[PDB]
Amino acid sequence: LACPAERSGHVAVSDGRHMFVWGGYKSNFYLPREELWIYNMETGRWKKINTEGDVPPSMSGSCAVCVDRVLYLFGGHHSRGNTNKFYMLDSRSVLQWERIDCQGIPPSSKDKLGVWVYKNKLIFFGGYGYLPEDKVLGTFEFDETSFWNSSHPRGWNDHVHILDTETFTWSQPITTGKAPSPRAAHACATVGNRGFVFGGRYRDARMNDLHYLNLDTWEWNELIPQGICPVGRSWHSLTPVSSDHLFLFGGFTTDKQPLSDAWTYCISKNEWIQFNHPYTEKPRLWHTACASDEGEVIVFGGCANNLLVHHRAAHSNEILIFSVQ
Template sequence: MKTKLTAILFTDLAYFRTTHLSMQQGNIHFCSLLAGSKALTHKQWVAQLPCWHKSPHSPLRCLSSRTAMAEMEDDLADAMPRRGPEDDEDSERDEDERDWVVWDEEEEEEVVVVVDTDMHLSKVDTPPERSGHIAVVDGNFMFVWGGYKVCFQNAEAMGLFELYLPRSEMWIYNMETERWKMQLTEGELPASMSGSCGVCVDGVLYLFGGHHTNGNTNLVYRLPLRCPVLRWEKMTNLKGLAPTCKDKLGCWVYKNSLVFFGGYGYFSQEGHRGTFEFDETSIIMGNHIARGWNNHVHVLDLETLSWSQPVTKGNSPSPRAAHACAAVGNRGYVFGGRYMNYRLNDLYYINLDTWEWSEMSVPQNGPVGRSWHSFTPVSSDHIFLFGGFTTYRQTLSDAWLYSISKNEWKSFKHNHTESPRLWHTTCYGPEGEVFVFGGCANNLLSRERAAHSSELLVFNVQPKSLARLCMEAAVQHRDRLETIWDYLPKHLLHNLKQRMSSNNTMGS
């Protein structure tokens, strides 16, 4: 038996190189991996991996094949979002439990060596493709952080190799000039993660939960976005009983509080209210901490810096993850998500003053059940639904507008029907535009290489402002109008020149 593997080493200086390992007659030979390396038996190699993993100076993280995974136990953590088995024959991965999977049709053993430090920093003018990231809006700027992407593919072994995006990178999109820029962050950086929950309150980004190389987390970070230097702060002085470690949850911002709902993560702690549904596959795949879906509601008060869990009333939604939430007035809406083997199309809202749940009727001509979609408020009466992933493994490109006053769904016609997306982000801009960034364009759970996207899709859900129309006309008729641009106010001239120099504009 002979198996080839490509390993990636990253150092704290963002230096990396690829190294080939070969396994032959039970020995693993490190070829130019480390100076003075020697051949080790498979058991000796596996035995040393936990030591390298725990070393504070080592960038190595390891994930192994099905046969070695049980031996490594919790000492070996993921270098990508966890994957888990599915009942379907065409896939062994799902959005709730994502362990590293190497496809091996010939029953050969695979060993995967990867890294848990930042990837080399991006050297491009636009953000790399990604899924499972976060995005928030502050003024005319959209901030994008985290997620993961495909690094390369070992075609011979049919292995998908994916890495988290650098945790120090914050990508900022100017909605007026249609330009991207990357700014490095400082301070107490969170781990590189996917499936986190990010919201912006008064110019401050709050980050909760997610999945990193050691599993799920329930830590909270804050990042002021209006400062020249972006500096992360870890919120360690929070009082009260925190939620369990989880990812793929939803959040509503109401008054001066963050209200979190649902998600997929560790078993409920004593004192938590709500339902936890255990996922048996989380144990089958070698994880030794029970995971599952929940429908818990947790409130983080940003004034008192304390956690609380309200006593809810009414018919609460089932446990779920990879759902989408939207806050309109004092109502927190939640649509869809995955529960067990089902992807849902139910719609609930909770009164954020009385904590009473209400279920809305599901029309026959409404959107199909889905997870990994987006649900974005675009007015006091409408919420915009886009994309997602169905129970039948279809990646969606449909868009819908939900009318709150009429309790009615209407299909939204657009020009991006050939751009399906799942696990993307959606932000609503001040000019009545919905910005969809990143996500995966194909079946993320299939054996084919995931088509992570770096494309920015723009949907116009309201008429463009006069200023925006004039800006677009000036760009379109540059040859005729450029000679009189100098008569424009300075800030308009600056925006116009920035837009003209942009090489990444995306039309709607």
């Protein structure tokens, strides 16, 4: 019974039955780049396989999706900085990574972003990284804390970029409405043609605002739920669990509190409902969450305390199972 090492900042994507886990870092360096960990949501068993081909660099903060058991990976932070390279791994059939020579203007090199999937489009939003190579659609805001501790300052963007998998070509939609502020470590979830985004870090706040981009018309909408809302946070997970509900777990507050609360957002009612679960002593940030075909949300990895104090950080290899349906 092999078991993967603890990590935060990894990626995890799922087909509803199997959950693929790649990358991340820990304390006590990056997790090995060639490994792909497969967790069976039914048997609860892990399996490690080695990948070949254009293996991506070891990274934290990468953004990944699974569409029809093809894995796509964008962005991240490796030993020499952020990237905007795009990879594909076909898991349908030893697995081979392919780095894609994309057409069009790619996003700026960045990590800690999110993605929506809608038909042939991968739609990426926000994140943290270098100044863009062009005045492209959207805004970018420097993080002044990066001016004095590195050789290349970095900041937050509110960019929306489309990767069209019919041609592997980058574009940007002309949107209407008020886009969210630039941010990183937000969480994105897709239901129907609505690409939701909750929270994230921007300047001196970790936020609790909720927006959605209509992925057909490209109109931004801010959602203002009535009643109690979850505390503002970054590094939380947000997962669709039905055509009407999003599941929220964990994260990190403005004043640096690890979180163990869970909520469901009822889309039809525009209302948050706090979710009762047995992991109140297991806060997690920079974990991943994947929904199963069996009505559960599978959380893996992440950190139980303030990961910014790297020498004390408590990175986890635990699986937390939330029974949402």
